[PDB]
Amino acid sequence: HWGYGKHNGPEHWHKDFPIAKGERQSPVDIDTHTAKYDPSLKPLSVSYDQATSLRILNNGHAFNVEFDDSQDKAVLKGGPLDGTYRLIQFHFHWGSLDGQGSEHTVDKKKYAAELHLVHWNTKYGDFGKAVQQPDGLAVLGIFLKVGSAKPGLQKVVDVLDSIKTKGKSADFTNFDPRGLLPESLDYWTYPGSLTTPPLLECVTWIVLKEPISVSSEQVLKFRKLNFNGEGEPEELMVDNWRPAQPLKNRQIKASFK
Template identity: 60%
Template sequence: RYLYCYWGGVLKRAIPVTINGNAAATAEIFHSVHAGPDKWADNFPIANGPRQSPIDIAPDASSYDAALKPLRLKYDPSTCLEILNNGHSFQVTFADDTDSSTLKDGPVSGIYRLKQFHFHWGASDDKGSEHTVNGTKYPAELHLVHWNTKYASFGEAASKPDGLAVVGVFLEIGGANASLQEVLNTFSAIKAKGKQTSFADFDPSTLLPACLDYWTYDGSLTTPPLLESVTWIVCKEPISVSREQMKKFRELLFSAEGEAECCMVDNYRPPQPLKGRSVRASFKK
C-alpha cells in the first residue's frame, strides 16, 4: 500500500504503509489524506464565504489610509509557555489571562491579547506563504494571533467579526535569523504530531521586521473552522531566514509517532477571492 500525503490538493510524497488492522490509526491517516483546503468546503461551507483568507495583495490596488495608526505591540517574554506540533503546523502558546502581551492600535480599537504564533511554509523556497504580493510567494509566513479582550475568552472572540487580529510576517531567504533559531532548536522534541515541550522566556517581538508598515483587510482563519473573525495586519517588510533554517521546518511531521512518516510541508491555504473587500495600507506608495 502507499499513503499519499496531501495539503491543498498537492501530492507531498508516496510512502509505503503496512495496514495492521488498527482502525483508529487507519482512519486518522485516511482523514489526513483527504482533508486539504480543496475539500474544506464539504464540512465548512464558510470556506466559500465573503471574507476568506488569505488573499493576494495588490499594492497598487490598495488605498493609503492616513487614519490607520502605527501598531503598538507589547510582548512579555515571561508569558511564553510551550511549543507544540498540532499536526498542521507548530505553535508557540502564551499565557493570556492578563494584558501582559498585547496588540493595540493599528487598524483595531481596544486591547488584543497574544494567544499563539505559528508558521506556514512550503516544500521548497519558492512557495509557502499564505498571503502573496502581486502573486509573489515567500518561502514562509509567520502569524501572531491575538484576541479582543472585550470578549470573555479566545473561544468567544473567535466567532465575532472583530474578535481576532493576526499579524502576518513574510520570511525571505537571506542571512540566518538568530531569534528564529531559538525556536528551531526545539524541533527535535516536537517532530511528530501531538508532541510538545516547554518553551519559556521567548520574546516574539524579536521576530518582527524593523519597519512595521502594513496592509490590512477583513478576513478569516486560514484553517478550519475558517471563521470570518480576523482583522488581518500583513507587514510589508519581510524578515530573513536562511536556506538551512527553512530545511529545519521541513523536518517536522504531519504524522504522529507510530504512523507512516509524512513530512510537514506546503501547509498553506491558497489565496481566496477578494469579493469586493478593500485592502488599506498604513503607508504611502
C-alpha cells in the first residue's frame, strides 16, 4: 500500500484516497506576511501534568509514542478549540538531511523535522468517531531544527534501537511530553487534514512558531530506523513527510501580534 518511495509516495496517494486533492489538505506553507493576527484567539491550554505514556511503536511510516486516552489525563484546550481534546499519540516526520523533513513550511523554509502531538475531541466519545468529524482532531505541530540537544527527547532516541523495524514495539511508560515543548506557545492555526492516508479532513492544526532545538546525534538516530519489517531488505526510515498542499479557500490565523 502507500509509503514515501518513488512508487508509492505522496504523488500516488490520490489514486486510493481521492481526498488527497480535497479542499482542506495538510500540510501547507505558512506565509508569515499573509497570516493575520486574530485578537479573538482564546489562550492555548496544554495540560500534560497527568499524561500516561504506555508504548512506542514502529508502524512502518514513523514511530508513535502512545498514551492512555481511556480518561481525560493529558488534554489540549483553548486556542481556536471548543471543548476538550485528549492526547492519544505523538510522532515525528523527518528528513534524510537537515535541509528537509518538516511537513508544514514557514515562508517555504523546511525544518529538519516536525513533531505532531495528536488529540481527539472527547465530545465524539472515541477516536474512530472523532476522525469522521470536521472538528474531530487537534494536532499540535512543533518544528525541529538541529543545534543543541533536547534533553527531553533523549529517552525517545535511546529506545529506537529496540523498535528498528515495522511492527516492533516497546514498553514506554512514564515519558513526560512537556519536555518536547518550546518556551513560547505562540501559534498559527488553520483547518486541515491528517497528512497520511486516509488523509481525513478532521484536523484543527495548531503549529507553534518557536522550533525546538535537537542535536545532530539525536536526529541521526531517527534516520537509522527502518520502514521495512524484520529481515526484509533495509530501507532507512527517512523523508517520511508529505509536501505542502494547496491552501485553497483557507485562512491561516496567528495567535500573536
